[PDB]
Each structure stands twice: as structure tokens, then as C-alpha cells.
Design a protein around this ligand. Sequence first.
Ligand SMILES: Nc1ncnc2c1ncn2[C@@H]1O[C@H](COP(=O)(O)OP(=O)(O)OP(=O)(O)O)[C@@H](O)[C@H]1O
Ligand SMILES: Nc1ncnc2c1ncn2[C@@H]1O[C@H](COP(=O)(O)OP(=O)(O)OP(=O)(O)O)[C@@H](O)[C@H]1O
Ligand SMILES: Nc1ncnc2c1ncn2[C@@H]1O[C@H](COP(=O)(O)OP(=O)(O)OP(=O)(O)O)[C@@H](O)[C@H]1O
Ligand SMILES: O=c1ccn([C@H]2O[C@@H](COP(=O)(O)OP(=O)(O)OP(=O)(O)O)[C@@H](O)[C@H]2O)c(=O)[nH]1
Ligand SMILES: O=c1ccn([C@H]2O[C@@H](COP(=O)(O)OP(=O)(O)OP(=O)(O)O)[C@@H](O)[C@H]2O)c(=O)[nH]1
Ligand SMILES: O=c1ccn([C@H]2O[C@@H](COP(=O)(O)OP(=O)(O)OP(=O)(O)O)[C@@H](O)[C@H]2O)c(=O)[nH]1
Ligand SMILES: [Mg+2]
Ligand SMILES: [Mg+2]
Ligand SMILES: [Mg+2]
Ligand SMILES: [Mg+2]
Ligand SMILES: [Mg+2]
Ligand SMILES: [Mg+2]
Lengths: 559, 559, 559
Amino acid sequence: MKYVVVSGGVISGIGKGVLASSTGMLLKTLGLKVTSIKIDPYMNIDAGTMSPLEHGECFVLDDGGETDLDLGNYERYLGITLSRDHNITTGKIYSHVISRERRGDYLGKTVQIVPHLTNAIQDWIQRVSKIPVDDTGLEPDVCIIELGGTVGDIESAPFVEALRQFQFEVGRENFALIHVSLVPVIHGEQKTKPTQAAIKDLRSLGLIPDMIACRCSEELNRSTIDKIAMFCHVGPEQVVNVHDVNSTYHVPLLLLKQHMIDYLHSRLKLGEVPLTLEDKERGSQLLTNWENMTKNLDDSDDVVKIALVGKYTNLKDSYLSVTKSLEHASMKCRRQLEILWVEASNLEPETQEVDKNKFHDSWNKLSSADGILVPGGFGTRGIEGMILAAKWARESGVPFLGVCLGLQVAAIEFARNVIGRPNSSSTEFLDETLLAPEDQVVITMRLGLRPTIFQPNSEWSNIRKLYGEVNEVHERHRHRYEINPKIVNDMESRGFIFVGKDETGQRCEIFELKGHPYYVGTQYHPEYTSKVLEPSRPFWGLVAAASGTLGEVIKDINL
Amino acid sequence: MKYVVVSGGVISGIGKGVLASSTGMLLKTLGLKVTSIKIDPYMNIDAGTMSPLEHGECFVLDDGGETDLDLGNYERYLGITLSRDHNITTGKIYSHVISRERRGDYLGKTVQIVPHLTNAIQDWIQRVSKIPVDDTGLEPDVCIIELGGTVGDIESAPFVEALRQFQFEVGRENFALIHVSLVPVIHGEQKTKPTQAAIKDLRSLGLIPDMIACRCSEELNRSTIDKIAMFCHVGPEQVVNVHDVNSTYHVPLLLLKQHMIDYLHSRLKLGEVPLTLEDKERGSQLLTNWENMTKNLDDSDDVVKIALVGKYTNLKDSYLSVTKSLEHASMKCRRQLEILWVEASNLEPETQEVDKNKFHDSWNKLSSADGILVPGGFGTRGIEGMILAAKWARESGVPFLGVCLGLQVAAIEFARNVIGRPNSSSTEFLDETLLAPEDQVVITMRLGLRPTIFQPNSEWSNIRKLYGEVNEVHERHRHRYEINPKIVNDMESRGFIFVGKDETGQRCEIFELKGHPYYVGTQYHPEYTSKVLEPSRPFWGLVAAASGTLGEVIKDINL
Amino acid sequence: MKYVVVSGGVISGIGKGVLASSTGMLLKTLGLKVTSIKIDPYMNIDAGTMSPLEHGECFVLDDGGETDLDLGNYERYLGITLSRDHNITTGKIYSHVISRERRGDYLGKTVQIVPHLTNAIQDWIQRVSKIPVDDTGLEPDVCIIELGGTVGDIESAPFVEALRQFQFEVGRENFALIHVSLVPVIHGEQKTKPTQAAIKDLRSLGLIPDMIACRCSEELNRSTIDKIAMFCHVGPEQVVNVHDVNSTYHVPLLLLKQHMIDYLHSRLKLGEVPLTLEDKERGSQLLTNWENMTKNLDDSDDVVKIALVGKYTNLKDSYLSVTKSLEHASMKCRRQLEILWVEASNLEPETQEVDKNKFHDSWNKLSSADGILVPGGFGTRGIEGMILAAKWARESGVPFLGVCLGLQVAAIEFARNVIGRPNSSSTEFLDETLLAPEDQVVITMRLGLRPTIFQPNSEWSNIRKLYGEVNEVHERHRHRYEINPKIVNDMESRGFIFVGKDETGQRCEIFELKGHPYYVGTQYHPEYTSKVLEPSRPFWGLVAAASGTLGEVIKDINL
Ligand SMILES: Nc1ncnc2c1ncn2[C@@H]1O[C@H](COP(=O)(O)OP(=O)(O)OP(=O)(O)O)[C@@H](O)[C@H]1O
Ligand SMILES: Nc1ncnc2c1ncn2[C@@H]1O[C@H](COP(=O)(O)OP(=O)(O)OP(=O)(O)O)[C@@H](O)[C@H]1O
Ligand SMILES: Nc1ncnc2c1ncn2[C@@H]1O[C@H](COP(=O)(O)OP(=O)(O)OP(=O)(O)O)[C@@H](O)[C@H]1O
Ligand SMILES: O=c1ccn([C@H]2O[C@@H](COP(=O)(O)OP(=O)(O)OP(=O)(O)O)[C@@H](O)[C@H]2O)c(=O)[nH]1
Ligand SMILES: O=c1ccn([C@H]2O[C@@H](COP(=O)(O)OP(=O)(O)OP(=O)(O)O)[C@@H](O)[C@H]2O)c(=O)[nH]1
Ligand SMILES: O=c1ccn([C@H]2O[C@@H](COP(=O)(O)OP(=O)(O)OP(=O)(O)O)[C@@H](O)[C@H]2O)c(=O)[nH]1
Ligand SMILES: [Mg+2]
Ligand SMILES: [Mg+2]
Ligand SMILES: [Mg+2]
Ligand SMILES: [Mg+2]
Ligand SMILES: [Mg+2]
Ligand SMILES: [Mg+2]
């Protein structure tokens, strides 16, 4: 087992998550089996309790774990499945040793942060990195650890102490440290004192960096490389840079151009790892596929515009799996994507009195779009604006996908306007008044990977054709509210077909509307099962439908 | 409310606990109401799970809290009652904020060590210092906080960060810092660089010391004072020393000789605290009583020897409340005390084969003693040796006190040798063989302050006369095993009278033997209710009985 | 825009102001945006010139408008902000059309009460009801107009004529009339001829009532309802009653029990007003919060007593915002309130010669109280009595709040007795003698919403913790006199800390005294920013401090 810590810097926004995911995928090009662990200094047990306004969305695993967003970067670059154990936190590990001290496994000893908590962290990392995470039976060859927060924040102290010990409690040449660090530019001169201070803060904790990975708005000067490589122990080829490029898929090839594998191939002795003839082929094949999708982003120009309608769209981190799911679906179509970020509340007619500027801009953006997405996220702000987007998309025949809350919004819209029930509404917020036209109801969560069964007549639907006309689908759920199953037959008779349901019925999971080119919704989040070469099927439907060629996509999928 | 932090140094053994207790009692000489809080960086919720081989005994509060030993130093110097809340720990406060984050009181925010855990520590200190701790109704004027561990140990980090904030979240002139620090002597020269480094480690965390309290084997030189007072912000009178004197009761008067009150009277503005005419009298009266008991230790010479028989007596911290209870009882008698530390196992005849030196020395020490104590502490090592000490004390008519296990050992001894049941024994360790002559049985703990009722005939006993012939007694329990109540009438008929029991009966709490000058035992720990001017009654009995004058002590108590 | 006139009756004391405020809040439970306008037949431009001995206190708006007291009932029930335009008067509107006729906008026409003044009233009501009054950007859906004085008083004539026209100059189903009327009981029989005469006086002016709201000391008999509903056009459900209950917060639920919303929901066609899904939730949520605070007044019993010390306390209308601010603060604590009304002059030692009865009763009341308030109000009567209450509260350690004059009285008290300047005094009344120990000085008014900045060291204070430790506070001022800033450093050195000041300094706005559980004063009136669910912070401090639990209140506010 090899370990690669990706760590620290001078700021919390530095973009470690891209570099960790990219470093792991580059190791996967050698054919190595790879896994990864995110460490969070926060005291929350999970990202589930904490609101999307901080650290972006929670990400859902097959376990039903509501983990930190960074686990999604690993799953979609590395192709692996992660467990709720792969997101370590301060909350998890203090809860673990405190529950263990009350149970008494420490034999009446005094329990202390060193050695007992730092040995508990090292036991967690040793257990969790040996969980098999590919579909194959094998234990991973390499583990990427991403150390969240910044080095020398008091929040991090047990993890920087544990990782010092770990560099010896596992062999050297089985452990290596990448430090990620800020190189700000002032008056056009590339200033280095922030990264020199961060390299000292690592040495103060006994962590010694094997590569320094600069984050900068420029190519590093050869003087900027030398002034760091002379201050730190790293050689000139071990001062990595990652530029402020928009395409995060280019980062693996920007690291490969900087010869970063050729250092780790020595520094971790990756030639001593045994590999089969299948492994080297499936490794090199994966690199050629990534050269092709990045070539397609360099030379595809013909924009498809998708409008994304939701709360707090200024927090673009709040929708990162949607963004990445749309980008995978646009690459599969060989088309460039624009996302138009529509703050759903500004669509509402009260905005035309309160701030007439925001009203006209938000309705410009929505009218402009070749297809529409309603992305999910609980909370009562802007839902009539999201209902207005679903209405516009139904009436103007514009491709629509509704994910989680977006499906319920389309059901409420179709009830208010096509069934003509003018006060039909979500149970989430009006039930203090005990309303009879319930569109949502409660059914304390439904979470993680679940089976959807396609209902027997559904063979006609574009969405069931996108799932290869298979009878069942596996996707990740997260909801407490679902469509009222008393009203379902009214919608299924008026043409809004609930194409798929849970095994028990009375719990709707996919709809497609008869008489529209692509108007679809899902109760699950299709984003989380997206992979770079195999996009999320409902999103491959939406981004093909917006472009045209949805028939040719379905004809392809029938091979 | 005023706060006085006592803190840190270069080593964990430095003796903060004496200085905190002494500083608080000196503030009590002004008539101020005083309280105190111990902070422990360990992850244990309580000292109850952890074995006496580390940090000495657990101390029992009236709550039944098995707290850190340092709470006992506060109760016996300050005269206060502490709650299980007055011992803060890493385990307590991480358990508190983690349970609070799962309950969700933090409104979906990300929870972090700063500000959320440091604000939870500051809320704990603010709540707990306002608990009334004297017998009177009033809230305390001053709180002493003792910061356990050492400054810049990673274990301490949330508490040194919290206390920086606290210096502002409560006013300056309502908070002050005492730093306690090591001044080692090499070649007879008093070296200062360890304390200069500890003063820098405080400044690095933003904590600024108002007094530096040196711990040294000498009087500080005036150069040793100046070389510290020139390096640090403290004036010459704010460099305190506490010498390696044996009598810890002299420390309050050694601080008073160094004019330490006259600094805090300015630095905490203690003249602005309102005080009544009763308060100043009961304050100054308390100082004169302490001048008298310390004068008596300077001029009493006529030694009483008590042998203390138990496990691990090399760990003299394991019996600190016994030691202090014996010292209070010897001072009340105006007699000097020697304790003879007898490792109970060495009394056993197997020792005479294994190491004949340890056998003869341990039996020398036991034969030498004017009275005998068997102190408690669970675990099967040496119990036949403790039975042999109880036998010797019964047969030779030598004063005996058995506390907790020491009472059960005397019951087992009296059963084996006076009732003549040769295999009668503790249920604690032989019950894998299901023995019928059970002396102990289980009755998951009995803990904290409980009532003992004296059984109706008991008026004759020296122990009930020592409790003023009152019908009931309040003392602190800690046990899972008690005397088999089926066998009690056999002992009460053979003369081993169970003088006191729980309200329900079938649970024995005090015995006295008919036909011995003072042979007594208690199921409770009488040590924990000892106070400097009012010693523990069973121990005032033992140390009077060893000296003679037990009648005159009882005649006094009848006033 | 909908209008609801609340009007008239047989007497000026009838309690329209409660019914208007309650009717508006009930409309706010539907989620409608609401506003209100008070009409006063008096010739004063504002309530600022007129003394508190008539129509109670003046109320201060954010504008600095010294408006009629009834505007405060609207702000505290409806949650809205009012402008100096929302109090219409005879003085305002005759000043408006006379200044407009001298300017000549009437093009040389003869100007007459009809149509020109009645059209000016209708233009005022149309302009002012469309001012946005919530924190949100929206124009109000409903306006409550309260017609002051009584119908057919000659003082009212232009307003009853204007409102007849207004019923057509705005649509019917956009205007409705509530008439409030007296139903006296004689020999236990509920006499109706006063209200029959008041209903005729409305018809004589062409105003037709849509509901009759009886004010009576009983439940109306069903015969009393029928004998009114047969004489007037109103149906049986449109004869409202409001009982002489003490809790004015119960009136909204007594109107809701009488189904009064279900009439206005038809009669104003409030189902035709568009509402969003947020609006209906924030509407129904507000009703549940009001059910809870009224449930708490039904089942809280554990009295806190506050003594209110001031001039003319027999005029309990003179302190209505203080009373309501104390009631909001007691409800937030879940405790019942008694106010003890202490006429401040009777505390003075001259009273013990003049009327020894009034002396002993006033000092009984002040000694009895768990906390003390000095409420403001200019004029030289009783100020030494208010100084004696401030003295008593400082010395006996009893919670104290001084508002406006009450802060200056506490500064004068602390100067006379703790600084020991025996003749230090207000500049307001002794300056004919040109005294050097000035405690007040003049600094022609300071009025309306202003910023207070907390001075840098103030983090310790209970008052700054009650304001959430925010650096700035927004509250309503009204004063010509302030603390002499030459003497401020003497008080700040002796412990009376001026915790907050104006942006410029030299103008003190909050004090808290070091060394008292809660002794505070404000130059602003904290009463006017009180709201039913969010009490005034200095008053939430006082009423918590009197009860105990001031720490737990501050711990709560830190969430
Ligand atoms: N080299 C990079 N190139 C482009 N974008 C980057 C780069 N580094 C960081 N970012 C961007 O900055 C944001 C944060 O990056 P990332 O998640 O990898 O940082 P992080 O250190 O893991 O932050 P966090 O601790 O919050 O998870 C993301 O939007 C990411 O795409
Ligand atoms: N000034 C002193 N004079 C005499 N003995 C001292 C002094 N300082 C410390 N000691 C002794 O050293 C031991 C530890 O002292 P103390 O309990 O006060 O230290 P501490 O800092 O509180 O240690 P801990 O953190 O383990 O509780 C005790 O036996 C105590 O009596
Ligand atoms: N229904 C009621 N229940 C309880 N108290 C009432 C009621 N109606 C009036 N009052 C009380 O009578 C006094 C005057 O009431 P209110 O201010 O509402 O009358 P008003 O018609 O507006 O008088 P004004 O014209 O002087 O403003 C207040 O103390 C008020 O609390
Ligand atoms: O204003 C002054 C005065 C003096 N100095 C002095 O400090 C020295 C250290 O040089 P710098 O502080 O400029 O550091 P650096 O260029 O090595 O590092 P970067 O942060 O640019 O990566 C010398 O340059 C000396 O003149 C300054 O740097 N700045
Ligand atoms: O062996 C050597 C050589 C050089 N130095 C040098 O270091 C200097 C600092 O002096 P010290 O290191 O002796 O420190 P100090 O006496 O101030 O502190 P204490 O630890 O005794 O309290 C000077 O004395 C200089 O000669 C040594 O201290 N020791
Ligand atoms: O003393 C007399 C004599 C005659 N009347 C006469 O006047 C009549 C009108 O009856 P009332 O004047 O009693 O009026 P009312 O009962 O309808 O109204 P309230 O004021 O009680 O609501 C009849 O009752 C007739 O006898 C009196 O009312 N009172
Ligand atoms: Mg941040
Ligand atoms: Mg990240
Ligand atoms: Mg140790
Ligand atoms: Mg200690
Ligand atoms: Mg009047
Ligand atoms: Mg009124």
C-alpha cells in the first residue's frame, strides 16, 4: 500500500481537491488500483446536517452517507466507489475515541491526543485505504489522502501530528507529501514569501514535502521555481505549478507535461508494484480516452446553453455535481456548454416591483436557453420562480430536467396549470393550514443507492431508452418528501407518466411527459453517478435534446 | 465575578495544585466568596474509568462524580463543595459540542474549534463559576481556574485559545494570569532559560502573565528575580517563588510573606468588591486559625506513627486524601505524624521465600506503628497481606481503621480467625468457583454523598461518640461490593458490631469491635469530608487512639 | 390596494387603537403586506409640542417624527416601520392646502373644504398607503385607517366627508368600514341606544358600516347581537365584540374566534390578492408564534415585580411603550409581570412631613421590587425622588435601567454619592445660578433613528452581550440634554463605564456600571424598537436580571 498526502498551503480556497483527484487519475494511467480519503478538520460528523451555503453541496455515497463535496471529485476522476468511512473528520474521530474510552478498550489508561488519538487516525487510514473501491475484488495499490483546512490551523493539529507518525508507522517509499501553496503576483512580480512560510510551518510539525505545488495566475518564472527549490528540499522538477485554466480536465495533462508521474514513479517505487498485462492495457487505454475528451474541449465550438434555475446561484460551489454532470453530457455530445445561472426568486412577479433590473435579466436568461434544469435543494425561497420555469419549459416545448425538488416543482406546476388545481402545493411549508390538494407528502430520510423499477407500459419513453431499455436502474436518493400517490393516477391519465417507482410502489422516481421532446424529472440525484466517459443518462438526454440528435443518441445506446 | 488562571510551566509535575488552592485561600482571608475549576487536557470524561496508577486516586464529590484528584485540594483548602461540572476535560467538551452538533443547535453552520469549541469552553466557565459553592446562598466573588497539562502541548490547544478570548469576553481587572514555571539549579547556579521559553510560549498564544511563580529547590537570588523580571512584563514583586518545603500548609504564608495578595488586590481591584462586616470578620478569623495550625507544626515534636497498608505505596499520590486526612487529624491532636508506607503484598509469607529482605522490612514497619490504616483501592494484589495487618491489629490491640476495602478485609479477617471459617472470602475474585462462605457480595456502583443511620443500640461506641452521638452521618460512598447481610448477625453476636447501615438496612457502613481500644471500619471514604480545621471523625479517632487521649477528644466533642 | 377604516363610536376612550392593530395583524396572518394610517382631528402638526398629560406620550419614529401614541400600537403588532406622513392631522392638512393656495397650485380657483380639502385628504391616503413599510421592497396589499376622535364631532368633519368620497374614489371591495361602539350595561341589561345613535350618525354622513364592533364589560347576549343586527345593515357575524380583558394580546384571537377574518376575506375579496409560497408560510408561522406567546400568558404564574419610578404615574397612558416593552421582555422570559407605579416625588423626604401616608407607601413599593426602571420624561418635579431610586438600586444591588432622563439621573446620583460632589446637578433647571458641577449640558433636539458605536474596551458588559456583541446599535433618540463630556473620564475611572457613544464621541448613549448584576442606562428610548417576538434588548436584560437567568439569556443570544 502506497500513500500520497496532498496538503495545506496558505489559504482554504487553494484547489487541493482538483490536484488530489488529478494526481490519483495519473497514477491510474499506470494501471495501479487507486483509492482516496478526505480529512476535514470540522466537528460535524457528516456534511448532511450543514447547509449548502457553506462548503457547497453535501455529496451522497452508495452507503447513504452525506459526505463532504470533495469525495465527488474522487469518484468522478478515479472511477471508484467511496464509503462513509472515506470522509474522516474531527467530529468522527473524537466521537470514536470518546465512545471507546467510555466502553473502556484503553484498559483504564489516561487517554491523550498523542499517542491515542493520533494512533486512532492512523488505524482509520490503514483500515479504510484497504477497503476495495473498484468493481474488481482487489485491494488498492495507492491511496491519496487529502488533508483539509490549512497547516498550523489549531483545528488540524491531531491530523498533522498523526501524519508525521504515519510517515514511519508505514515505510518511506510507501508514503509521500505534496504541499499545495499560493504564489501571489503583485506589480507583475511572482512573490514567494507566503509559500516559504507554509514550507516552514510543515517543517515545524516534522512533515517534509516531496513536491511543492504552486497555485498562481501565471506560468511560474524559472527564477520563481529556483527561489522556491533553493529554499525548500524539493528539486526543480518537484516544484509543480497548476494554472488558473477553466477546464479542470486539462490539469492531469498539465501535471503530465510537468513530468510529475516520473518523480512519483521513483519516489514511491511504483515499478516494484506488480501489474498484469490486462492492467497495463486498461491503464494506457484510459490515458488515450482522456487525451480525446480534452482534444474535444480544445476544438468543439458550437454552444448549447442550459439554464440552471435555483436558490443562491452566486454560490456556484452549491451545484458542483450538476455542473460536472452537464459538462460530461456536453462532452459526450461533442458540444461546448454555457450554463446560465438563474436565481429562481428573480423570476417571480414581485421582483418586477422590488428590483425591476433583476426581473428582466433573470427572464432574459431563462428565455435564451436551449434547455432547462431545476437542480434540487430544500428551502422555501424561490419555489414559485422554479414553478414558472417549469411552466415556461412545458408550454414553450423547451427541454426540461427536474432533479429532486425539481421533479416536485414540475408536478406542482402541472397540477396548478394543466389539471387546473390553483392552490395545489408542497406539504413542506403550507401544512400549518392542513390543505387537501397535497402534491408533496412526507414518506426520517430516503438515502443512498436504491433500485427504481420501470412501470410496465414505459417502453416508449426517451428516458427509458436512455437507460438502454433495462427494466431497473440504480441511482442515489436523498429526500423526505415525495409525490402524493393518491393524485398519481390523475397525472398518469393527463399524460404526465410516472415512468418509474420504488419496488413497493406508492413512491415515484422518474417521470416523462407524453407530448414534449424531452420533459423529464427524477426523485434521485442523477448527478452523483456521472463519470467522465459515461455521463449521467438523464443529463445526456437533456444536453442531447437541447442540441438536437436525441434519436441518434438513443440509436447509439441500443448497441 | 473575578477570574485567576493558574497555568502551565515546563513540566507536568510542577505543583500548580498547591499554588491554586493556596492562592484561593489567601483570597478567602479577605472575606471574598471563592470557587475553582480544574481543566484537564485528557480525553476521559471523568477520573472514574482510569486506574489509580496514573494521576493518583480519583476524588469523589457529593454528586457521585469521580473527578480528578486536584478537586480535593480545592475542597480542603477553600472549604467549598464542588460539582462534577467543576472538572472540565477535553473528553467532556468535545462530547458536549459533538452531541450539540448532532442535535443541531448550531443551525446547520460548520462547527469548528474556533469559535464554537472555544465559545463552549467560555460558556462552561461562565456557568460553572456562578454555581454557589459555600453553604451560604451567595454566588462566588472570585474563581480560580487551574489549566492542567503544559502550555503548547497540542492536548491543551482549545483551552489556551479559549482563555485568550476569555481575557476580553470578561473584562481586564476581572481576569488575571499566574504562570507557574521551573527554575532548575545546576552547579549551584539558578538557570532561567526554561522559564524564559515558557513565557514566550504564553505570548505565542496571546496569554500575558501577570505573575511568574517559580518552583525551585532554593530561595531565588535577587539576580534570579531581576533576570526574569527584565525578560518578562512582570515587576520584581510579581516574580513569586514557592520553595520545596514539606509542609504544604506553609505555602499560603510563604505567598503572603512575598506580598502576593497586595498585587492581586490592585490587579483584580478587589477593593471594589462589596463586603459586609460579618464577611471581613469571618475572613480575618480564618487567617488567625491558619497562623495557629502552622505554628503548631513548627513546635509540635512528639511523633505518632501510623502504618498505611496497601497496593502500590511507592505511588504516594495514590493516597493523597488519606495522607491529608491523617495530617488534619494529627494537627487537631497537636502531634507530629509519621506515615509508614507498607506494601501490603510484602507482609505475605510467600515474600519470605521470594525476597526475604522485603518481608522483614514490611513486618518491621507494621510492628513499629502506634496505629494502622487499611486505605481502600480495588484489585486482588496483597489482600492476604491486608488480612494479616487486620489480624495483627485485632490480636495485638493496636488501633485500626479500615476504609472501603479495608472494612471488608477486617470482616474477612474476623470471619477467618474469630468465627473460624477458614476459606471465607471476597466475592470479587473467587466466584468462578461459586463459594458458599461469601463475606463480600455485589449489591453498577454506590457513589457520592449518602446518609448512614446509626443502628439503635450503638450509643456505647467510640465511633458514634466521635460523630457527636448524632443519629445520622453524611459521607461519600464509592463501592460495588458490601458485607453479606446473611452473615451480619453472626459478626454482631460475636462482638463485631455493624454500628451503622444505609436507610434500607442490608448494607453495612460503619463497624466497631466490642473489646478493643479503637478497631473501626467504614464502607464510605471518610477522607473526602476532611477539612483543615475540622478533621475526618474516624481519622480523628484513629490518631487520638494511637496517641492516647481518645476519652478527652470525645469529652471535647460533647461540648 | 385594500382599505379598512376603523372608526368612531360614542366616546373618545373606546379602544379603537387595539382593534385597528389587531385587525391588521390578523390580515398579516394571511401573508398580506400591511400598513396603517392614524388620523387625528387635533390642530397640532405633531404630538411633539403637546405635553404627556394629554393623549399619553409622544411616539418617536425612525424619521424623528414625534407622532401620536397610536402609531406605536401599529409598529409593535404589525412589525412595520412608519413615517411622519402616517399620522395625518387637521393641523397637517389645513397647513398643506393653505400653503398650496398661497403657492397657487389651485390656478386662482376659490379653495373650499369640499372638494379641495377632501381631495387633499384622499391624495394623502393614496400616497401614504403605497409607501413600502416592511423591510422587503413591496408595496402594501392592505391599509388600516384609524379615524381618531368621534363621528359628528365638528373637529372630524373634513375626514368623514373625505372618507365618504374615498369609498368610491377607490373601488368597493377595495374599501370597508369597521365602526367601534359602546354598549353600556345598566341593572345587568345590555343597553343598545348609544350604538343605534352612532350608526345613524354614520348614515347621516353617508358612511355605511360593514362591521359593528361593540366594547362592553360582558359577552354580548344573542338578543344584544340581534337587536343591533336588526337595526343596522350588518349580519349577526358582523356584530363583533371585544371584552374588557387585561391581556391586549388576546384580542387577535378573540376576533379570530368571532370569525372576523372570514368576513373580510369575502368583503375585501382577499382571495383575489396574489400571494407566493413564501408569503403563506411566513403568514401561518406568525399565527403559531402568537398562539404560543398567548398560551404562555395563560400558564405562566411566577411573578417578577418591576418598579417604575416617574412623574404623573396615575396617567398610565403616559408610559405605554415602557409597559409594552416590559410585557414583551417578561413574555420572552416566560414570566408574569407586575409593574409597581411609584410617583417619584413621594419618595422625597419632604413628603414625610406633607403626607406621611404617601411617603410610606411609595417607599414600600420601591423596596418590594425585583428590578427598577426610571422611564424618561422632561420636567423638574420628583427628580430627587428619581435620584433616591437610582441610589437605592446602586447600593442594594437591585437591577436598574435608566431611560433618557433616567440615565442622567443615575449619572447625577453616582456623582452626588460615589464621586462625592454634593451639589452636582442637571443644567436643565439650576443654570440661572451658573453652577460649575454640570452633570447634564445642552448639546434644538436629537431625534429619530441614530447609530451608537460601542467604545473599544466594552466587550465585558452585560448590555453589549445583550446586543449580540455587535459593534453598533440602531435605536431612537429624543433629547436636548446629555452627559457633560468633561466629567465622563471621572465616571469611566470610578467604574461607571459609558459603554457606547455617538460616532463623533462627546455624546454618551449607553452606560453599564462595573460591579453590579445589571445597572444600565440609555440616552435613547429602547421601548420604541420593541416587537412582540423580539423584545427591546435593554429591557430583556432588566427583566431577565430581576428574575435571574441573565447568563442563560446571553448564552441564548450568542446562537
Ligand atoms: N488548479 C486549479 N485550477 C483550477 N481551479 C482550481 C484549482 N485549484 C483550485 N481550483 C478551484 O477552487 C475551488 C476549490 O478547489 P478545491 O476544492 O480543490 O480546494 P480545496 O483545497 O480542496 O478546498 P476545500 O478544502 O474547501 O475542499 C474549486 O472551484 C476548484 O475548481
Ligand atoms: N510548591 C510546592 N511545594 C511543595 N510541593 C509541591 C509544590 N508544587 C508541587 N508540589 C508537589 O508536587 C506534586 C504535584 O503538584 P500539583 O498537584 O499541585 O501539580 P499539578 O501541576 O497540579 O500537577 P497535575 O497536573 O498532575 O495535577 C504534589 O505532590 C505536590 O504536593
Ligand atoms: N377592547 C379593548 N380591550 C382592552 N382594552 C381596551 C380595549 N379598547 C380600548 N382599550 C384600552 O383603552 C385605552 C384607549 O384605547 P385605544 O387607544 O385603542 O382607543 P382609541 O379610540 O384609539 O383612543 P384614542 O383616540 O385616544 O387614541 C387603552 O388603554 C386601551 O388599551
Ligand atoms: O523595505 C524593505 C527594507 C529592507 N528589506 C530587506 O529584507 C531583505 C529580504 O528580502 P525580501 O524581504 O524582499 O525577500 P525575498 O525577496 O527573498 O522574498 P519574496 O517575498 O520576494 O519571495 C532584503 O531585501 C533587505 O533589503 C526589504 O525586503 N524591504
Ligand atoms: O558555550 C557557549 C557559547 C556561547 N554562548 C553565548 O550565548 C549567550 C547567551 O547567554 P546564555 O546562553 O548563557 O543565556 P543566559 O545566561 O542569559 O540565560 P540562562 O539560561 O543562564 O538563564 C552568550 O553568553 C554567548 O557567549 C553561550 O551561552 N554558551
Ligand atoms: O319610560 C318610558 C315610556 C315609554 N317608552 C317607550 O319608548 C319605546 C321604545 O323602547 P325603548 O325606548 O326602551 O328602546 P329599546 O328598548 O328599543 O332600546 P335600548 O335603548 O334598550 O337598546 C317603548 O318601549 C315605549 O314604551 C319608554 O321606552 N320608556
Ligand atoms: Mg471559508
Ligand atoms: Mg476540497
Ligand atoms: Mg506523567
Ligand atoms: Mg494538579
Ligand atoms: Mg379627553
Ligand atoms: Mg388611539
